Ligand binder design. Sequence first.
Ligand code: UPG
Ligand code: THM
Length: 288
Amino acid sequence: MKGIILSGGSGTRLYPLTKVVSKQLLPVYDKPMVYYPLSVLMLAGIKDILIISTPEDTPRFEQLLGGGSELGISLSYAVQSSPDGLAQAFIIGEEFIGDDNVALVLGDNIFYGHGFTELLQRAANRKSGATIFGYNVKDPQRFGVVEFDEKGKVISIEEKPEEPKSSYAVTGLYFYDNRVVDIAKNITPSARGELEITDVNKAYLELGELHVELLGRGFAWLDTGTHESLLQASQFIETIEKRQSLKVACLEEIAYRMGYISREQLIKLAEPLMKNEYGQYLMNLAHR
Ligand SMILES: O=c1ccn([C@@H]2O[C@H](COP(=O)(O)OP(=O)(O)O[C@H]3O[C@H](CO)[C@@H](O)[C@H](O)[C@H]3O)[C@@H](O)[C@H]2O)c(=O)[nH]1
Ligand SMILES: Cc1cn([C@H]2C[C@H](O)[C@@H](CO)O2)c(=O)[nH]c1=O
């Protein structure tokens, strides 16, 4: 499986925050937003990842994450010339994806909760169909929305409905088989002139292979779209971290716990950052 992080968009709502800094490099407590969705692809066992951003911000993610091999993964970069919607990721990434299955995660999505990584791996290792993730939210009409039935099987899937048929939001994390690129090629802009992931999910629904994993109320799903939610997501992270002295979405911890790196490689990483807390945190970990 390959991974794609959609990490672009013009950053309107966060102005002036986003005047000279890209949205997904802004802090969520103690590390760049982008670390959060990257962590998720890593835990799913995806080792080969395309990061998409704007022409002016794409180089700045590349300056931060490099080419991935310090995390013992592989990272690549592509420019989205402008934000024509999320399905466009599969067009822009057609060539990085090629022959394989692909998972898409939104660059401004924070996921967290016990057992989450078991769910991610089932999905990441499924070799056909789509997997999407649902979550009971306050104002479901703000999001894609999935209604399902009895057995947990999907009866519909609609983008931002004036009258939502369900509380379960479709979240910014998606797993697909190889058919998705030719799917995204063959549908067209909506009323807001974007290529909609909902219509990508609608297609899989017709093929009879759209799976939902529904996330219960023990998971957290936040997105970092506004000054209010950004700060909220921030408080929520530091509360988890202050308490347990474990970090959320520390990339190097995940590379190592996941096998992508060795103790000795983790130690080479810790070593130059020993002047700061994040480095001592990595070093503590190698000591076990
Ligand atoms: O072409 C694009 C479009 C969006 N983005 C970014 O991707 C994120 C998603 O866009 P946004 O406008 O914030 O959300 P919506 O487009 O309204 O909704 C999408 O993302 C939601 C995630 O909350 C889902 O619930 C919806 O079903 C899905 O349509 C944002 O961070 C954008 O900056 C890009 O980088 N390029
Ligand atoms: C093991 C591990 C889990 N997680 C996250 C995934 C889940 O959302 C939550 C519980 O595993 O913690 C990390 O962020 N980093 C880690 O190193």
